[PDB]
Every structure is written in C-alpha cells, then in structure tokens.
Amino acid sequence: SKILVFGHQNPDSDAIGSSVAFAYLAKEAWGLDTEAVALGTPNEETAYVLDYFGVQAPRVVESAKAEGVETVILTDHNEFQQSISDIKDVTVYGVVDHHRVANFETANPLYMRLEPVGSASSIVYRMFKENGVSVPKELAGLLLSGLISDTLLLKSPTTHASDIPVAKELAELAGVNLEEYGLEMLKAGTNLSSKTAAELIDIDAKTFELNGEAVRVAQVNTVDINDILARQEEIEVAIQEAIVTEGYSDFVLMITDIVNSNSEILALGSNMAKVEAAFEFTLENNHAFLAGAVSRKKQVVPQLTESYNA
Amino acid sequence: SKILVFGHQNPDSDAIGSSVAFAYLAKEAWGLDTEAVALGTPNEETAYVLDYFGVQAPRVVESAKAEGVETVILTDHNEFQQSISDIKDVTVYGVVDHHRVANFETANPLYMRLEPVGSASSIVYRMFKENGVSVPKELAGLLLSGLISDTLLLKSPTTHASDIPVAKELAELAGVNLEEYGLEMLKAGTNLSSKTAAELIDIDAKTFELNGEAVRVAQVNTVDINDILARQEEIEVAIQEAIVTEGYSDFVLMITDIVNSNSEILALGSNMAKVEAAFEFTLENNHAFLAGAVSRKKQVVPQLTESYNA
Ligand SMILES: N[C@@H](Cc1c[nH]c2ccccc12)C(=O)O
Ligand SMILES: N[C@@H](Cc1c[nH]c2ccccc12)C(=O)O
Ligand SMILES: [Mg+2]
Ligand SMILES: [Mg+2]
Ligand SMILES: [Mn+2]
Ligand SMILES: [Mn+2]
Ligand SMILES: [Mn+2]
Ligand SMILES: [Mn+2]
C-alpha cells in the first residue's frame, strides 16, 4: 500500500533532506512502502548539496492521483495551502515538522512528531536513533545540510541547544568539517545572477492565509543587500504581476544578508499598515531595514499573524 | 514559568491519567513547572480508579487567566472547542493526543506527539521509557486504567498491537491482574442510576463542528441497552433542552453495551438524513441499532465528518 513522502512547495535543502532521509527510515524500521518525492526543482543551494554527496534530486510529482496514491507523509510543513496540489482528497498518514500549525485537518488519528528546533532534519536524525537504524553516510550528508541551511550554520534564532550535538555527530558521519562545508554550501545559495526577477521572488516563497487575506512571503539569500536593491525596478514589476495573477492581497520580500544577519523588507499590497504594525517600521519607497532578522518562521509569520488579527 | 496540563472537557479515565502522569514526567525529565489540573469532576469510573490507587482527583480549573497562566499542555484532545474555556489567548506548549486533528491552530512551532493507538496514556508511558524515568506504581495504575477504559479491556477497534506489551508491563507495575481489575473498574462506569437524564447525556459528550453545524455526540456505558431505552422519554426531554439552549444543530447518543460490543443510536436535530447516511440505517422512533460499534473516534466521527460534507 504505497506512500509518498515530501516537503513543501518551493522545496528546499531541509525540505528535501528530511523527506528523503525519512522514506528510508520508514522502510527499514517499519517496512512501509514509502517513496520520497518532491514538488519542484531543487534550488541552487540544494543542487550543490545534492551534487556534493552524489544523490539524485527526487522526481517531481503533480498530484497523488496522478501517481495513483491516496496516502502521504508530510515533512517540513503541514499547512494545506503549502502542500501537494490535491491534499484534501488524500489521507495524511504522518507528519514530521518544525513549524506552527494552521489550515490542517484530518478524519482519523495520525502520527505527528513536531518539535520546535532548527530544522525538520534534526528530528528525523534523532528518530533514526530511537529505532537503532544506522544512517548511511550520504543521508548523514543531506540531513546535515538541511540543518545548516535552515539555521545559517547554527546562528539563526531557531537553533535549539538540541541541534548542537546533532551537528557534530552528523558532520562526522558525513566526513566533512562543519565550519568548512557550511560556508561553501551557503555560498551556493547566494548566487542570484542565474535568476530573473520573476524566478527570484519565487526561489523560496510560501503562501499564508492571514485573516481572510492571502499574503505571500518570499525570501532570498545574499551577501550584499544593494545587489538586489539595484534590481528594485524589475523585482517590483514582477511582484505586481504575481499579486494580480494569483490574487494575493500583499507580497512581502525578505532580502536577508546571511553574512551579517540582517534583512531588507520590500512589500506592496492593500494592507501596508498591517505590515508596518508587525515591524514597527516605515516603508520608504516600498521598503525598510530590519536589523538582525533571518527567520521567516520566528520573526515574520508570528508578527503578521498578530497585526492582521489586531 | 508555570504550565497547566489537562484533558478535554467532560474529563475521563484516559483524559485524567495521561494528563496527570505527564505533568510528573515533564518536571522530572526537563524540569518544567507543570501542574496537572482538570476541567471537571471525575466520572464514576475514574472515581473508582482514583480511589483504588488512592490518588486525589485534580482540582477543577475555570480559565488559564483565572490561574494567571499563559502557557498550557493538552493531552487526549486538540480541538479548540473541546479544550479549556480560554484556549485562544494562551500559548499551546505541547500536545500529546490520539485523535484526529481539527479546529486547532498556533502562532509558533510547538511540540506535538500524536500516535494512533488505543489511548493517549500508552504514549505517555512509552515516553516515560524514552527518557529513563521510572514510573511510580500509582501512576502505573492511572495510566493502565486510561488504556483499559479507552479500549474496553483491549478489544475496541482502536487497540493497536503496540498496546499489548504496554498492557502487561503496566499491570505488573501496578500490582493488579489485568483481566481481573479490568472488569471491576469497567463495572463502575455502568452504574447509571446515580444520574438523572440531564446528567446522563453529559457524562461523556463532546462538541463537533461539522461543516457549519454544531453536532454534539455523547456516549454512555451499560450492561443492558433496555435500561436506558426504558428511560427514553426523559432522556429525550433532556436532549431537546440541550439543543435549544446550546444551539446545537443535532444531538447523537451512543448507548454502548460493553459486554457484547454494540450500541444503540438515539438522535434528533435538523440533519437527520445526514445521520442515517453515515450509518446506513433507519431511525424508528428516533433510534436504531448499530452492530459491533464501541468507538466514537473510529466509527462515528469519520462517518459524520463524511456525510455532512457529501
Ligand atoms: N509505522 C511507524 C509510524 C510512525 C511512527 N512515528 C512517525 C512519525 C511520522 C510518520 C509516521 C510515524 C511506527 O510504527 O512507529
Ligand atoms: N521540554 C521537553 C518538551 C517536550 C518533548 N516532547 C513533548 C511532548 C509534548 C509536550 C512537550 C514535549 C523536551 O525537552 O523534550
Ligand atoms: Mg526557509
Ligand atoms: Mg471516550
Ligand atoms: Mn523547509
Ligand atoms: Mn525547514
Ligand atoms: Mn479521553
Ligand atoms: Mn482517550
């Protein structure tokens, strides 16, 4: 009785790693019929991880029905609007995630395992351990990347103390130096020249349903804010097209400096006041600086989730 | 930083056991400041368990604000309408449960641990084991009861294979014979003479939000269906009062024979067709027989959840 295992739309290092990693555990521990698949082309960062360990990027799926499957397992997400296209007409078997919970419901009791930690991979790893399954080296690689990717080499305000031992142990199992491998994959994600302003606002974006509204929050990684601020024009022309065509209410863009841990916010839409409220700032020409922010999940989502209700 | 730990409204053996059991683990494993409390007077069954092991029933709480607490941990439930009165203005720290998920959302990532097993207590026990904490005898007692109560001495279609070892091991730790203690507590819950038809429809009931509707599903334990069917009149007079006063759309009552594993369904409301659909049966005089049903969570909820949508 076949089961797909996947990450969210616009899939990322953590999203792919955790998902793939686990389809393996499930088979070996409980002899389930799990096949890890994904909902998109890997990003430039994941590409590098995938090629660095010589794993093939997981095939891209359309809908469960297309695969003739009714039962799934979600990793790194749970919000129905972020999931596979036909998530309403399937059974969720199990969820392994590290996000807040919204727009998620079921008919029957499932397995869930959510912990608030720096990645969804740190959990899958910990779970490999509870069931005495040895991690192949190459999954130790993916999993690790997942954790580096998500935490920005263990310095995001999402890094939990539980992550640190997890780091040592994985790096070792992968045969890389942590400090040394970390920078060189993180670099691979800051190359934004291969991307047109259309694709750019959509390397890493998610839809949120705040209080009636569809708000779409996107993030990019860079070493220099003004590179993207020099592309402001097209970037905005692209953003507008998205809001019209998709029926978003607003769009929010985090231009994160991973070297200094800051972001610039670029936002347009009908609810600008709701945005400024969430950030105690002023959009000068559609944007503003936000000092020390790198986490969408801890420094963006909760705040919007509040000022859109208030 | 104080944290309440509790079961659902109309609290039961599993609801109290699991909740109490865990407030202990949390303290001893992670030194949290958890105090187990509950939202009602124990039922006649739990009473017997509580007195059999000499534990005091947990104080009854009004609202978190009344206790000056903002952070909670839910066991044996998750549906906001089944929880403490002010669950919207608190932070959910963690959830340990074995039900489907609905009407549940958060602002931040939490701990969840849901598994589909015969009780929420079988999970707390298993969890005591992952963290090398010895269970006091008397918590081994509560936990066990929780699992017996919920499964009807391991014969409900909710008993998982994972429950059986859990049973042996707990019974032993409690110093009771499983077969022998099981019947004598289960008996304690079938005494429905101490209850007026008002209280009767509300020993064990939960509200469900199916597709706009408020449907309220109640269950009783008996050794003889016709005892309750002989009380039909008042029982119905009481039911009506509930539907008017609360603004339910319909009421459903499972008259479960725990000796033979059957239930009689007694239902009134605006959506009778939606009910009959879910059960392939005909209400003769507001009721009908349903052969082999004992589980609200596996044989009632999913079916309504479907015919109310269909
Ligand atoms: N078959 C697995 C199911 C499971 C356990 N934990 C999970 C977490 C997520 C998804 C599925 C699971 C088991 O017996 O343990
Ligand atoms: N403080 C606990 C938190 C926790 C783990 N599992 C949980 C399940 C439910 C609620 C809380 C928890 C820990 O460090 O592990
Ligand atoms: Mg991310
Ligand atoms: Mg029950
Ligand atoms: Mn992710
Ligand atoms: Mn992640
Ligand atoms: Mn319960
Ligand atoms: Mn229960």
Side-chain angles (χ1 to χ4, degrees):
Chain A
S1 197
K2 194 89 163 322
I3 308 162
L4 303 176
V5 197
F6 43 99
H8 48 73
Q9 294 176 7
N10 276 7
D12 70 70
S13 293
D14 189 38
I16 312 282
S18 58
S19 63
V20 180
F22 191 95
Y24 183 94
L25 175 84
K27 209 143 140 71
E28 212 82 37
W30 314 304
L32 311 188
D33 193 50
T34 42
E35 181 204 8
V37 310
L39 300 152
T41 312
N43 70 52
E44 277 228 64
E45 170 187 297
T46 314
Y48 172 103
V49 167
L50 282 165
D51 160 297
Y52 191 105
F53 291 98
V55 181
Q56 286 280 324
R59 58 181 188 115
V60 174
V61 128
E62 277 310 15
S63 68
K65 181 196 250 156
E67 312 285 316
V69 186
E70 308 111 347
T71 307
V72 308
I73 282 156
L74 320 180
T75 95
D76 197 53
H77 75 286
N78 66 80
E79 288 193 52
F80 269 8
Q81 81 282 336
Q82 293 179 1
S83 189
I84 197 180
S85 72
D86 60 336
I87 193 76
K88 278 150 177 214
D89 324 300
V90 288
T91 305
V92 171
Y93 186 104
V95 178
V96 176
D97 184 22
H98 63 135
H99 294 86
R100 73 103 186 259
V101 190
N103 312 264
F104 174 77
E105 55 175 41
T106 63
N108 306 275
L110 64 170
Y111 285 96
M112 297 189 77
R113 181 87 187 260
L114 275 63
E115 320 185 3
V117 279
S119 87
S121 302
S122 331
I123 297 158
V124 164
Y125 172 63
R126 242 181 265 108
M127 275 190 43
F128 261 72
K129 277 182 84 163
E130 291 180 2
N131 307 237
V133 178
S134 269
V135 213
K137 172 199 262 272
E138 28 132 327
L139 298 186
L142 261 49
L143 284 157
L144 177 68
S145 311
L147 166 66
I148 284 163
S149 174
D150 259 38
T151 37
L152 295 181
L153 226 154
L154 309 185
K155 63 194 213 209
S156 189
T158 68
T159 328
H160 191 247
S162 82
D163 292 311
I164 305 196
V166 170
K168 302 246 73 35
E169 295 163 36
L170 270 179
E172 199 185 8
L173 294 161
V176 314
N177 187 237
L178 179 61
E179 265 310 345
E180 220 212 325
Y181 170 84
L183 306 149
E184 287 296 312
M185 59 153 263
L186 293 175
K187 277 191 84 189
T190 57
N191 179 41
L192 295 169
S193 66
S194 50
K195 296 293 180 304
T196 74
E199 316 172 305
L200 183 318
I201 70 184
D202 201 45
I203 311 180
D204 190 9
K206 276 167 190 168
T207 295
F208 295 94
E209 320 277 350
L210 303 183
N211 217 129
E213 309 295 276
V215 170
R216 145 81 50 152
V217 196
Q219 193 185 4
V220 283
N221 287 159
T222 188
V223 289
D224 194 348
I225 291 208
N226 321 298
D227 284 14
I228 290 82
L229 277 180
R231 292 141 94 0
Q232 175 157 353
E233 249 180 29
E234 326 94 84
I235 302 214
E236 284 192 352
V237 152
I239 281 164
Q240 309 221 3
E241 206 79 54
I243 302 179
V244 175
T245 302
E246 301 315 309
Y248 304 150
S249 25
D250 328 83
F251 199 107
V252 181
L253 174 78
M254 302 182 52
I255 321 152
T256 302
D257 186 336
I258 66 178
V259 193
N260 301 284
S261 289
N262 286 282
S263 329
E264 194 83 19
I265 317 294
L266 171 75
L268 350 171
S270 75
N271 292 294
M272 286 310 83
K274 312 233 173 175
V275 155
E276 291 176 290
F279 292 128
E280 270 104 25
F281 68 11
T282 297
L283 304 167
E284 263 327 84
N285 205 247
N286 300 307
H287 73 78
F289 186 71
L290 210 87
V294 316
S295 202
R296 174 168 52 203
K297 114 254 293 294
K298 220 182 140 175
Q299 299 163 294
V300 176
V301 165
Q303 285 74 343
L304 298 172
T305 291
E306 187 186 22
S307 58
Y308 268 83
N309 283 245
Chain B
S1 197
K2 194 89 163 322
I3 308 162
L4 303 176
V5 197
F6 43 99
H8 48 73
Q9 294 176 7
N10 276 7
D12 70 70
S13 293
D14 189 38
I16 312 282
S18 58
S19 63
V20 180
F22 191 95
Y24 183 94
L25 175 84
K27 209 143 140 71
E28 212 82 37
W30 314 304
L32 311 188
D33 193 50
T34 42
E35 181 204 8
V37 310
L39 300 152
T41 312
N43 70 52
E44 277 228 64
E45 170 187 297
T46 314
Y48 172 103
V49 167
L50 282 165
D51 160 297
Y52 191 105
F53 291 98
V55 181
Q56 286 280 324
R59 58 181 188 115
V60 174
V61 128
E62 277 310 15
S63 68
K65 181 196 250 156
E67 312 285 316
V69 186
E70 308 111 347
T71 307
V72 308
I73 282 156
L74 320 180
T75 95
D76 197 53
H77 75 286
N78 66 80
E79 288 193 52
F80 269 8
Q81 81 282 336
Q82 293 179 1
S83 189
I84 197 180
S85 72
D86 60 336
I87 193 76
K88 278 150 177 214
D89 324 300
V90 288
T91 305
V92 171
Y93 186 104
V95 178
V96 176
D97 184 22
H98 63 135
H99 294 86
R100 73 103 186 259
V101 190
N103 312 264
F104 174 77
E105 55 175 41
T106 63
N108 306 275
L110 64 170
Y111 285 96
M112 297 189 77
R113 181 87 187 260
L114 275 63
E115 320 185 3
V117 279
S119 87
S121 302
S122 331
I123 297 158
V124 164
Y125 172 63
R126 242 181 265 108
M127 275 190 43
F128 261 72
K129 277 182 84 163
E130 291 180 2
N131 307 237
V133 178
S134 269
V135 213
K137 172 199 262 272
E138 28 132 327
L139 298 186
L142 261 49
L143 284 157
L144 177 68
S145 311
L147 166 66
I148 284 163
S149 174
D150 259 38
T151 37
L152 295 181
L153 226 154
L154 309 185
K155 63 194 213 209
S156 189
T158 68
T159 328
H160 191 247
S162 82
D163 292 311
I164 305 196
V166 170
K168 302 246 73 35
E169 295 163 36
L170 270 179
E172 199 185 8
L173 294 161
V176 314
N177 187 237
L178 179 61
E179 265 310 345
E180 220 212 325
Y181 170 84
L183 306 149
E184 287 296 312
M185 59 153 263
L186 293 175
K187 277 191 84 189
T190 57
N191 179 41
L192 295 169
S193 66
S194 50
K195 296 293 180 304
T196 74
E199 316 172 305
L200 183 318
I201 70 184
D202 201 45
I203 311 180
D204 190 9
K206 276 167 190 168
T207 295
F208 295 94
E209 320 277 350
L210 303 183
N211 217 129
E213 309 295 276
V215 170
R216 145 81 50 152
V217 196
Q219 193 185 4
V220 283
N221 287 159
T222 188
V223 289
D224 194 348
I225 291 208
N226 321 298
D227 284 14
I228 290 82
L229 277 180
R231 292 141 94 0
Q232 175 157 353
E233 249 180 29
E234 326 94 84
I235 302 214
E236 284 192 352
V237 152
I239 281 164
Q240 309 221 3
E241 206 79 54
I243 302 179
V244 175
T245 302
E246 301 315 309
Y248 304 150
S249 25
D250 328 83
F251 199 107
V252 181
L253 174 78
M254 302 182 52
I255 321 152
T256 302
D257 186 336
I258 66 178
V259 193
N260 301 284
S261 289
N262 286 282
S263 329
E264 194 83 19
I265 317 294
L266 171 75
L268 350 171
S270 75
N271 292 294
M272 286 310 83
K274 312 233 173 175
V275 155
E276 291 176 290
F279 292 128
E280 270 104 25
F281 68 11
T282 297
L283 304 167
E284 263 327 84
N285 205 247
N286 300 307
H287 73 78
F289 186 71
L290 210 87
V294 316
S295 202
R296 174 168 52 203
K297 114 254 293 294
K298 220 182 140 175
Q299 299 163 294
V300 176
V301 165
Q303 285 74 343
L304 298 172
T305 291
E306 187 186 22
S307 58
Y308 268 83
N309 283 245

